[PDB]
Design a protein around this nucleic acid. Structure first.
Length: 49
DNA sequence: AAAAAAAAAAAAAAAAAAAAAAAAAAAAAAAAAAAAAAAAAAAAAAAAAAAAAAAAAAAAAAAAAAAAAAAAAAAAAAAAAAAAAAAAAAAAAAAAAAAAAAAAAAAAAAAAAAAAAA
């Protein structure tokens, strides 16, 4: 269907795409949700919603 | 001269393949539109350049949203067990150039035969 989905591409080999509803609201001041996106000595570049 | 293996007799067991004819689909190989890409012309918006200017960082200082401290409480993520996906390492292989052995054409010359001359 059309459902809001996240996508991100990193340096090297990443085109991972999780669903948007897994992450919940937070108050600005805490952050650090620690998403689970394994990366071996590369750098993230892009996120899209 | 001893050993061993093929082949053939006849009732039994058990298999395999080539084509025709029409109509539909599925691979697989081509011309041919159609658009990127590239070479070589003229052409034209941007940087340069200069003078002239006035809009936002400094500075004084209050005060009001703040980030550390304290506390309680919820429970995301990390590391350890197992269980699947997916890719290099190494080894193997079927056609394929190289070599060697047998079939068909070749004439030189003669044995045997057929035929005829005087």
């Amino acid at each position: 269907q059309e459902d809001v989905v996240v996508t991100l591409s990193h340096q090297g080999y990443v085109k991972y795409q999780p669903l948007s509803e897994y992450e919940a609201q937070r108050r600005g001041g805490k952050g650090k949700s620690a998403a689970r996106i394994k990366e071996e000595d590369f750098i993230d570049r892009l996120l899209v919603a």
